[PDB]
Symmetry: C5
């Protein structure tokens, strides 16, 4: 129902755990193109080492160019230490801030799971639904509502 051919979307994704990132980035892109008439040349895809750099990657990017919506994609898996918990907390509050500070919609495409299986399942593998598809429509809608 929502078409956004004049929309410029930015996708910033971490590179840790690419087995799950790719399906997500891919689904987010295809859904916007095939279902929302977004033009491929209007979709910038940038990356950062890990999820911690996510907020900063987005902030730096929406300062140089102009986008209508941004999607932050990353995957965090609980480890042996308290790392997962603290990073997850920081990046989440961070993304929310970068969005409220700039006035640019920031779609939350961060997965915070207990194990690899859970991440892949939410990436569309092994019978699960690909959450990247949802983030794509979300970005399109927020972009339009922001004009």
């Amino acid at each position: 129902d929502l078409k956004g051919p004049e929309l410029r979307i930015l996708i910033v994704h971490a590179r840790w755990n690419l087995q799950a990132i790719e399906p997500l980035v891919k689904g987010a892109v295809e859904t916007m193109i095939e279902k929302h008439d977004v033009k491929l040349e209007n979709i910038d895809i940038e990356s950062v080492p890990g999820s911690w750099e996510l907020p900063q990657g987005i902030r730096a990017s929406i300062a140089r160019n102009t986008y209508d919506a941004v999607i932050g994609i990353g995957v965090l898996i609980k480890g042996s230490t308290m790392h997962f918990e603290y990073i997850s907390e920081a990046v989440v509050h961070g993304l929310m801030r970068v969005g409220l500070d700039s006035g640019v919609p920031v779609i939350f495409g961060l997965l915070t799971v207990l194990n690899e299986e859970q991440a892949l399942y939410r990436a569309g593998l092994n019978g699960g639904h690909n959450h990247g598809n949802d983030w794509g429509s979300a970005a399109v809608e927020m972009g339009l509502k922001a004009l």
Copy 2:
């Protein structure tokens, strides 16, 4: 127990921003918020803007974007979050809550907390007035009117 009011706010302009995930619970709430304001607080239908966003995460940004274009006396953020298999529930709830509180304090506009953070669907519906529960949306409506008036 919650102590609402009998205040009248016919000149108030109210904004309601709700997510669309889990509409089975959202509708009753939104509807409750609206009826209570009209039938009990003399708020005029034309003065009630109802906008939506995909999910609860876009709730704060939706409100911020909207209270910048138009002028409202109070805002109500409605959404439903249910605990899943991952830590998703935990982190989103935390971000959105801190977020609503900020949009409110930054702008100076009252923001009523109409976000349900439950463990399962059943709990959500119950607080939506179904299966014998009390509709929390009615509560949010009187709170919105009251905060609207106290903000002059």
Copy 3:
């Protein structure tokens, strides 16, 4: 030991669970008058629906009038959902913000208990100490130190 007859104090309390709120507001007021020589005319008592509106009730108020200290009073009880947890967090961080932003002392008179019994006990009922008295003295002292 401190006297503050020229002090103007603001009290904003939620209305949910008045069985506990009243004793607290009363203890805060009496303690200031009978023990700190604060004048009744100089004490503004306002209310809001619930604890969530507490930060905004205070921000709105200390912007229209001038107070030397404020007391935020509310009672939150753990329910069946994660509600209690998330609202508590937000109100606490929020009260702290309103106080640091404005420069006005904000006394924390917010009870975060597991049940009604605990709330009343800290309101001075059933053999407990009334915490509102404590908040009153805190308000006077902070008011004076703020000059």
Copy 4:
């Protein structure tokens, strides 16, 4: 082995649980004087009712006078309700804020323990190391590095 004779330090401590506070404030002071050549007349010691007023006490103070470093000292013990949890969280984030906002180093001298015994042990009693000494050096070092 850092000397800071020209440093002006500020110490704001809460008054609740003085049995533990004193040893801490005293250790911080002694260490600075005896080991870092800090002048007694350049040390301001102020107090507030409780830990909640800690952030506001410091903000107010580093606005009237000029200090090179500040030390916030308080003791929080877990009780029967969730009070401990929420106040600890708010005070901690608050102290960190006052420090980043102003540009004045703020040393974290806040003990968040499960019981009185743990508080006293970290105050140097019953065979424990007095943490106030550590806070004193930290303050001196941060004061000098802030130039």
Copy 5:
């Protein structure tokens, strides 16, 4: 990562508590940048603070006096008998994230929050573990470059 940054000025601020683990980390971060990213030794400032609490303030104070392209905050926090670990970790983490978003300078998270010494050392490359300091070095170089060009 085949990125080279010979014109980059990197800042490293590390706490001094628990040096047995800090050193391997700081060393790994520095060797990695130089040997693998052509970063010049004279363009790498290494500063320290007493503990992890002072980490955010140390970085803020430093990126205000000089100009850096990226900063790395290194420290080690270990769970104790009290709630200290929990609250400090929380504050420092949110703090580092803020110093970075406020200034516009990339801040790499080199803070280990572990349950015991063994876990820290293992992540510092000892006893058969991978040195995380290396990763932070590459990260710093990449963020530094993406923040310019």
